[PDB]
Curated annotation (Swiss-Prot), chain A:
Cell compartments where the protein resides: Cytoplasm; Cytoplasm, Cytoskeleton, Microtubule organizing center, Centrosome; Cytoplasm, Cytoskeleton, Spindle pole; Cytoplasm, Cytoskeleton
Domain of life: Eukaryota
Name of this chain's protein: Katanin p80 WD40 repeat-containing subunit B1
Coiled coil regions in record: none
Organism name: Mus musculus
Disruption phenotype: Homozygous loss of the gene is embryonic lethal. Mutant animals have dramatically reduced body size, reduced limb bud outgrowth, microphthalmia to anophthalmia and forebrain abnormalities ranging from microcephaly to holoprosencephaly. Brains of mutant mice have reduced cycling and proliferating radial neuroepithelial progenitor cells compared to wild-type, with a more profound loss of cells that depend upon asymmetrical cell divisions. These cells also show evidence of increased apoptosis.
Section covered of the full-length record: 485 to 656 of 658
From Swiss-Prot, chain B:
Oligomeric and partner information: Can homooligomerize into hexameric rings, which may be promoted by interaction with microtubules. Interacts with KATNB1, which may serve as a targeting subunit. Interacts with ASPM; the katanin complex formation KATNA1:KATNB1 is required for the association of ASPM. Interacts with dynein and NDEL1. Associates with the E3 ligase complex containing DYRK2, EDD/UBR5, DDB1 and DCAF1 proteins (EDVP complex). Interacts with KLHL42 (via the kelch domains). Interacts with CUL3; the interaction is enhanced by KLHL42. Interacts with KATNB1 and KATNBL1.
Post-translational modification: Phosphorylation by DYRK2 triggers ubiquitination and subsequent degradation. Ubiquitinated by the BCR(KLHL42) E3 ubiquitin ligase complex, leading to its proteasomal degradation. Ubiquitinated by the EDVP E3 ligase complex and subsequently targeted for proteasomal degradation.
Identification of the protein by name: Katanin p60 ATPase-containing subunit A1
Family (UniProt): Belongs to the AAA ATPase family. Katanin p60 subunit A1 subfamily.
Disulfide bonds: none
Subcellular location, record wording: Cytoplasm; Midbody; Cytoplasm, Cytoskeleton, Microtubule organizing center, Centrosome; Cytoplasm, Cytoskeleton, Spindle pole
Interaction with KATNB1 as annotated region, ranges: 1-29
Chain positions found as Phosphoserine: 42
Shown chain mapped onto the complete sequence: 1 to 78 of 491
Free-text note on domains in this protein's UniProt record: The N-terminus is sufficient for interaction with microtubules, although high affinity binding to microtubules also requires an intact C-terminal domain and ATP, which promotes oligomerization.
Length: 166, 78
């Protein structure tokens, strides 16, 4: 291609890149300022309120690395974000949601099952478990709606369907 | 240098950055700046030199933005 053509093709996207990255960094700075308090759930809630999905993804990619930072309460915020990410056109967004979902299932499903199986302070851990179960059931319905036929992210949804077959 | 290759590598750097794959974005940003540096070295036309240097400045802006985002992400302690 000619120089003028190559440069035009390159320059066309620069203004958007600059603005998108500036805004993303501003939003990450806000989230980071809450994160340093050690209140992980409030940090994630702040990211959700800002409603920059790329920042939710970046933050989950961080928290997905250390399951020990997850409290039961955090699942009530993350599960709805997983459902949203599982409907993304971006394979990497789906993958981030799948990773968060696998972490939650491995860390909290036994506890959730124990709490919900108990016979009729403590009513707060029970309340959180009941909410997590309904949110997990919602994701289960989504995965089942998407795995009967191999779709855009068929491989990821086949794996999720098998994992959640319980 | 192949201009088509430079265009493609800018596109890939930007796509990785937009999708939060900052490690790969930086590889492509630094790689394409090296390619533009080599191309500029061959440019004698003064008008083309000015214009390609301006592209080089703009890509540097984006690359620095990604680097600074990565620094902030690394600041999240687990």
């Amino acid at each position: 291609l000619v120089d003028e053509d190559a440069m035009s093709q390159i320059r066309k996207g620069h203004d958007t890149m600059f603005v998108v990255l500036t805004s993303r960094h501003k939003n990450l700075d806000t989230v980071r300022a809450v994160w340093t308090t050690g209140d992980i759930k409030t940090s994630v809630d702040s990211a959700v309120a800002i409603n920059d999905l790329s920042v939710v993804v970046d933050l989950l990619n961080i928290v997905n690395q250390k399951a020990s930072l997850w409290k039961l309460d955090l699942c009530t915020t993350v599960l709805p974000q997983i459902e949203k990410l599982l409907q993304s056109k971006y394979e990497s967004y789906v993958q981030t949601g799948c990773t968060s979902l696998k972490l939650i299932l491995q860390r909290f499903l036994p506890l959730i099952t124990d709490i919900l199986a108990a016979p009729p302070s403590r009513e707060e851990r029970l309340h959180k478990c009941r909410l997590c179960f309904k949110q997990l059931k919602s994701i289960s319905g989504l995965v089942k709606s998407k795995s009967g036929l191999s779709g855009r992210h068929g491989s990821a949804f086949r794996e999720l369907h098998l994992l959640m077959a319980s | 240098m192949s201009l088509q290759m430079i265009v493609e590598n800018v596109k890939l750097a930007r796509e990785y950055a937009l999708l939060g794959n900052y490690d790969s974005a930086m590889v492509y940003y630094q790689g394409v700046l090296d390619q533009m540096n080599k191309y500029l070295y061959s440019v004698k036309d003064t008008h083309l030199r000015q214009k390609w240097q301006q592209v080089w400045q703009e890509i540097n802006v984006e690359a620095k933005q990604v680097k600074d985002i990565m620094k902030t992400l690394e600041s999240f302690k687990l």
